[PDB]
A paper describes a structure:
Lactate dehydrogenase (LDH) is a tetrameric enzyme composed of four subunits. The 1,4-dihydronicotinamide adenine dinucleotide (NADH)-dependent enzyme [name] mediates a redox reaction for the reduction of pyruvate to lactate at the end of glycolysis when the cytosolic NADH/nicotinamide adenine dinucleotide (NAD+) ratio is high, which is a crucial step for regenerating NAD+, and is needed to maintain glycolysis for the survival of cancer cells. Full-length [name] is composed of 331 amino acids and includes a nucleotide binding region (residues 28–56). In our structural study, the X-ray crystal structure of purified human [name] showed a tetrameric complex consisting of 4 [name] subunits (LDH-5).
The [name] structure with MA (bis(3,4-methylenedioxy)-8,8’-lignan) was solved at 2.6 Å resolution in the space group P21. The asymmetric unit comprised three [name] tetramers containing one MA. In this study, one MA is located in an interfacial allosteric binding site between two monomers. MA binds to [name] in an open active-site conformation. The oxygen of MA binds to S183 residue of [name] through hydrogen bond. Compared with the [name] structure with malonate or NADH, the [name] structure with MA induced large conformational changes in the active-site loop region, which is often referred to as the substrate-specificity loop. The residues Q100–N107 in the loop region of the [name] active-site with MA migrated to the open form over more than 12 Å from the closed form. The root mean square deviation (RMSD) of the main chain Cα atoms between [name]-MA and [name]-malonate was 1.29 Å. Binding of MA to [name] can decrease [name] activity in lactate production by suppressing the binding between [name] and the cofactor NADH. Despite the inclusion of MA the [name] complex maintained the original tetramer-like conformation.
Numbering used by the authors:
A (entry chain D), B (entry chain A), C (entry chain B), D (entry chain C): 1 to 331
The structure:
């Protein structure tokens, strides 16, 4: 008899179906930063990685496995076949196309559509009850594409949206005020990028509205120039790409924060992109980031934030530009 | 409409089924210690508590709920009705009967058999697929009892066994050598109590056998009297009960550790009590403590420790004594 | 040639002094709840416990010690004698006298003063640079006493205040809303107890104020009853005491949350009692709960909440009550 | 008066010297893996990054700072100037020279001495009491270089050595036995690289020696060929480099596990590289991996493993080769 059998007596062997599996699609810097964050928060009893480049996929999987002694996620698997993703609670997408020189906004989205047209049906094939977390940019439009292709209900298709932008907001706010970002509250909503909206009314510390104590806040007369905080938020990623070539660590922690709320059914309020037909005068099928309650079933509730008219108009305007592209795609 | 409806648009309605639910039965000091450690290790999306004294149970649940801001377990429930325990992956049994002056050990067990005849079927009714972790004393016999009455397979009924005794042993080993318990290694096996067996052959640091270095180890010729380390293990709860009147914190911590291995499917080895007919000449249906691989199916494998003649004899003697009593029970 | 020395080669022997030491004064249910919560959050490399009953004290230290294997705090000590508290970064005081029948508020406070004339000087003797977290009740008066007897600067003397009161408020707020407490924001300030102040202006989810959305909120015209959420907060401990005899877990969790901000220099904002002479017209040396910024030097900063004139009145009445009793205390 | 002063009243302004600071030198993949794991395990209240490429340096620090909201390390600083390093408890060196096509061993080491002639004296300038953890390869020689240049006592210069080799060994062991690596015990010792020594005699589960059960274990007669497990350990990095370009995640988790033992003073045992002249019959100033007790003083103690005559001779010959390189280095 073999050493294993001499040492161990087996009671029963037939086993499986992981109870808390997460898949990351795409193992670029963003995907791997999500992977390492998820692993170190103990969110999953199985992590699956899939990407098109087979060697790097196997490489990144082997590197993670070599660190199992220091982890509590007993099964890490990889492959380009999406069969490795079967029975995932959460599937995080982070894959797609980078912008070519002088390319239209449209048609870039379309190349990305053509990618999701392979990724998304394979995901649904193997985890039909999963929740989908779209991180690939342009995240608002691509979350729509994944919803259209998957046929999932609107609550189980989530985009990372302004979740990291709001994190950055609060970091920069805490730097001005000398307070930890956990105690600086403030929301960046809407379309992810140049045209996000900073909701100055809700910017507080300990419930003290900063707009009340400083009514010029977020305007032009603002001698303290508080609108620069929101400018710094939308320039953040480019500032970091300029310096290290790409962002990864911050997006990876906010995705894990979002994974936490989903996998542990916390019902925490996050600014993520969800379908907001029926709200703020939006009548098209578009996703924008509003504060959502995330949990075991994705987005089960929305917070109806009171916007000004200038805020309300800026949202309807991004809604229109997104549908303008989205109506011009084809699937 | 309400303030809720005004602030919150709702997408879904409350289909749930918890996916990582734990129940502790018995809210004495042991149970509450298990509860608070499970809560602080983030092992469950729902904790249910059950006992017969309604007052204490509602207050303990309310006390925990007031801490929810600092926890990652968003639903804590309690009730004397076991319907609150529906859909538990793990049920931890701490309730029982305390031995009276001059009550024989048989009859003590039988009072517990009569209590378990109420708890175990109610647990099975609402969680037919759970793992059962029996913490109530005398643990080896009461694990037999919860097995018998539930009709679960052997892999899904576990007793605390010598888990905490082994932890205690490594603590004492650590203090003697000036190393942390995590890097001190030794196993206490068999019947939990005065007759447990210390496997002197397994005691080591960094794979350096202490018995080989110091052959006298564990005998009476031992100048360093290492046999009193096992004397301390089996007298610890007694000395701690002299001082504060009960033990709680170290049993809670050791139980939470087993729960982590089960809930996360780690396949770590722990000395817990499992039915060991077939090993070491034992031919009756007796539970003793032996190193068991723990995962999402409970005990999937066990380690066949090489024991000396003397060591094997004490296991045979405990199995006889245990069957001696189990033979006279009445289900 | 012992076993240890045959096994282990020593490089140097001297050179300890704990780097992140915490003391808990008092080992009643509250203090032990703090101890286990602090131990499970890994905030300390040394934990010291002191009380007058040597029995329970030694037995609580031994119970915590037995679980070392499951912990990351390598030294746990205890003693009647304060020299075991030497070199604490943080000393948490839970000890006190409890009101007997017939006894008046003053006299009970005087008894507490007399106990603090032994405890406080002995903390200072051995950890002169520590921060003092004062949990004993009435917490506002006794934070003053600790401040007066120690001569510590006011940043280094802190009362747990309405920390757990705000945490309760957010639990109940989250129940009414279907949202996790981490996402329901709201502050209870002032005197800890019946006279506490629920600052309705700051109540919000995602920065949407509930008062602005539903202006009857808090007042008596309020159809939805929100004023009762606060008096539920005020009767919480009473409802739990009536049921289980005392409260332990929730206060232990909130105190550990304060410790984490202090030990880790987070500069998170907490509603704790500090000396507020010079704000809101309060002119006497009196401690009430405001949002304080908390870190390695204690209360470094303090938020100035905008209060309505009735709210201002309440803090004035409370501060007047408190000086009424403190000017009668005998140090 | 600013918004900040309207919102916050300052009590105390000068505040500093950090109390749990860790520096990582080098912000390539290894160093950044260490940084994210350290941040992810709440080991430091300040983290400093140092490297010579200022752009990448600032970019990685900014990326991590943008996730502040998800972390518990309030201060992340960076600079090419080592003054940002001041008052570190622990300094992790990952920087070095990349090998060149057709460059000998003594040559590549010499260019690494040229680099350490700048790094080490600067570290020692600003943290003269720190612990030095060398991760740069060849780790055993470069740990010797760092010790010669620094003038530190041997307890405070630690090479990462075989720590990850043992972790990989225990993963491969667990993959064969169906047991988690935590419950699998191995020890790879000596010189990091092709010539390390797997101590077959220590390999066990639950104290059951594998070589005693299966005595051909590790040898050429082994019908199960367990020597192939060391072979996979020794060429695991070659395999990952060929697939993904470099190795990062697993070395980051293993360096963090070393950091947790030093910063929390655990006195866990780790196979790290230490100065061994005087032991295993070695006569020269060379560093070899050996099991060391790690705590706040660095290596306070080390374990004397009993080694066969073959194993001792493999260490002596590794030691002869290392001294042969080292005795020709130019400082
Ligand atoms: C006998 C143990 C056996 C054991 C089996 C199973 C277990 C267990 C311990 O703990 C948890 O599950 C020894 C040989 C080896 C060892 C290993 C790892 C170490 C160490 C020393 O120092 C620090 O990290």
């Amino acid at each position: 008899a073999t050493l294993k059998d001499q040492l161990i007596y087996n009671l029963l062997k037939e086993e499986q179906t992981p109870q808390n599996k997460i898949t990351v699609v795409g193992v670029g810097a963003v995907g791997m930063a999500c992977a390492i964050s998820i692993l170190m928060k103990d969110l999953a009893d199985e992590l699956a990685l899939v990407d098109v480049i087979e060697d790097k996929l196997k490489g990144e999987m082997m590197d993670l496995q070599h660190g199992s002694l220091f982890l509590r996620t007993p099964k890490i698997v990889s492959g380009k076949d999406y069969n490795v993703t079967a029975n995932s609670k959460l599937v995080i997408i982070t894959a797609g196309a980078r912008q070519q020189e002088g390319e239209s906004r449209l048609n870039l989205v379309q190349r990305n559509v053509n990618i999701f047209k392979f990724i998304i049906p394979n995901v649904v094939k193997y985890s039909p009850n999963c929740k989908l977390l779209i991180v690939s940019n342009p995240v608002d439009i691509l979350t729509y594409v994944a919803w259209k292709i998957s046929g999932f209900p609107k609550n189980r298709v989530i985009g990372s949206g302004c979740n990291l932008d709001s994190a950055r907001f609060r970091y920069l706010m805490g730097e001005r005020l000398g307070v930890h970002p956990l105690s600086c509250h403030g929301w960046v909503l809407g379309e992810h990028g140049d045209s996000s909206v900073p909701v100055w009314s809700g910017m507080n510390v300990a419930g003290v509205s900063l707009k009340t104590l400083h009514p010029d806040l977020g305007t032009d007369k603002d001698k303290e120039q508080w609108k620069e905080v929101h400018k710094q938020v939308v320039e953040s990623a480019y500032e970091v790409i300029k310096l290290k070539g790409y962002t990864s660590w911050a997006i990876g922690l906010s995705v894990a924060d979002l994974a936490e709320s989903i996998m542990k059914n916390l019902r925490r309020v996050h600014p993520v992109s969800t379908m907001i037909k029926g709200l703020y005068g939006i009548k098209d099928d578009v996703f924008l980031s509003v504060p959502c309650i995330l949990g075991q079933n994705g987005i089960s509730d929305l917070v109806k934030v009171t916007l000004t008219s200038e805020e309300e108009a800026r949202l309807k305007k991004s809604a229109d530009t997104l549908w303008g592209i989205q109506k011009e795609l084809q699937f």
